[PDB]
């Protein structure tokens, strides 16, 4: 198809960003409502950190990043996981691979 250039490319890029940001926000919002309804355990980084490592061997430092990454993963990607305990198995799996 036709390549978008100059101002059109930029504007398509800007509008797509807004679209993906609303989708991003909405995915978590919707997952949280469903998590309350099934009685999924509230996400707690500290408790999770006690049972596995969420620093990437220290590569990941900013705690506002570690929360965002793992809370969102817990609710959005793994909606059938119900406990922080189970989610730890998963996180450990992710850390064992590249």
């Amino acid at each position: 198809m036709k390549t978008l250039t100059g101002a059109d490319a930029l504007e398509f890029h800007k509008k797509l960003k807004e679209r993906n940001k609303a989708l991003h926000a909405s995915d978590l919002e919707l997952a949280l409502v469903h998590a309350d309804a099934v009685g999924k355990e509230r996400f707690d980084l500290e408790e999770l950190e006690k049972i596995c490592d969420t620093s990437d061997a220290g590569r990941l430092t900013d705690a506002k990043e570690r929360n965002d990454i793992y809370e969102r993963m817990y609710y959005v990607e793994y909606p059938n996981v119900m406990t922080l305990k189970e989610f730890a198995h998963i996180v450990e799996t992710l850390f064992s691979w590249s």
Binding site: M1, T3, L4, T5, A9, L10, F12, H13, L16, K17, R19, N20, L23, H24, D27, D53, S55, A57, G58, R59, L60, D62, E65, I69, M73, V76, E77, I90, T93, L94, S96, W97, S98
Partner: protein, 331 residues
């Protein structure tokens, strides 16, 4: 060993500290290792550094200024092919090392898993921590590495590079060491990554991760894609960015690019698709005749078509999650 202990517990001296940078600084200390293993570490860093230096010399001789070549993309998206075809200066260098010399946390895995014994005896997961630590030391020695002209060495990083903090750190590395950033970002649909992983043979050296690794990698690389592009839209002197996506027939096409500050969208439809993870559940989907036929219907290359169905047939009747899990546990 006795169970799936890691090689850092097995070859590490004394108790294993629970959390890097406490486990990190413990790993970083050679005295914390058995002398045989420490000797193995030195030998592999020397092999790797020799390969990287070869890449750097080839690249500089071909008129390439100090550059961090970054190959972003989820597992088994077709990054090697793209590099080979779409970065010809790198393709010429990689040919002189048979693809060795790149910065990749998996580069040491086979050597560590065989431990010079002549056969693979540790699982990928057993050696992962050790090889991650070796890759970081490898990369550390490269950051201010020089060629014979005194120029900073070009380097090649082919990690998933899925997260912002990863992206930020490599940009900072490049900025601090005077390197350009040549970034190729390669996308395939999740199912292509899953099929790609099942085609990888244990006797082959390419990693075979289980489903959650591939899926979570996919979500992250897609969700953080436009942030990467912004870094290049915002700072043309950073280097160049190109995004390649997968058409229905499985061919890579360019989707977006920032080349010399110029931003263009070569494929708006794909650009919209491959900047989000489209959560609409794949892990439980069963590999049956229909799935196999469907995937075959969009593969015209005979060798690839054959390898693809052969890999899938081995796990027919299994869910994606169960297939990758089973294929992952093979040594």
């Amino acid at each position: 060993a006795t169970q799936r202990k890691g090689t850092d517990e097995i070859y590490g001296l004394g108790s294993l500290p629970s959390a890097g940078p406490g486990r990190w600084e413990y790993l970083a200390n050679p005295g914390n290792w058995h002398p045989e293993r420490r000797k193995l570490h030195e030998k592999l860093l020397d092999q790797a550094r020799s390969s990287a230096l070869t890449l750097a010399e080839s690249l500089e001789s071909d008129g390439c200024q100090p550059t961090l070549f970054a190959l972003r993309g989820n597992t088994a998206t077709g990054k090697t092919r793209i590099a080979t075809k779409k970065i010809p200066v790198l393709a010429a260098a990689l040919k002189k090392t048979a693809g060795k010399g790149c910065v990749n946390p998996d580069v040491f895995k086979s050597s560590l898993a065989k431990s010079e014994t002549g056969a693979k005896i540790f699982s990928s997961a057993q050696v992962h921590s050790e090889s991650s630590f070796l890759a970081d030391r490898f990369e550390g020695g490269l950051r201010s590495q020089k060629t014979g002209s005194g120029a900073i060495a070009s380097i090649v990083v082919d990690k998933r590079l899925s997260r912002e903090y990863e992206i930020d750190s490599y940009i900072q590395l490049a900025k601090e060491t005077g390197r350009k950033v040549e970034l190729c970002d390669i996308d395939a649909p999740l199912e292509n990554s899953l099929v790609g992983v099942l085609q990888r043979k244990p006797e082959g050296e390419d990693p075979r991760p289980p489903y959650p690794v591939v899926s979570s990698g996919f979500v992250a690389v897609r969700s953080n894609r436009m942030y990467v592009i912004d870094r290049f839209i915002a700072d043309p002197s950073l280097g160049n960015y190109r995004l390649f996506g997968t058409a229905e027939d499985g061919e890579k096409v360019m989707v977006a690019s920032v080349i010399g500050g110029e931003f263009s969208v070569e494929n708006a439809e794909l650009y919209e698709k491959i900047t989000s993870p489209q959560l609409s559940d794949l892990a439980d989907k069963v590999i049956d005749k229909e799935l196999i036929d469907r995937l075959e219907n969009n593969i015209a290359d005979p060798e690839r078509a054959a390898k693809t169905r052969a890999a899938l047939e081995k796990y027919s009747g299994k869910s994606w999650s169960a297939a990758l899990a089973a294929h992952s546990e093979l040594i």
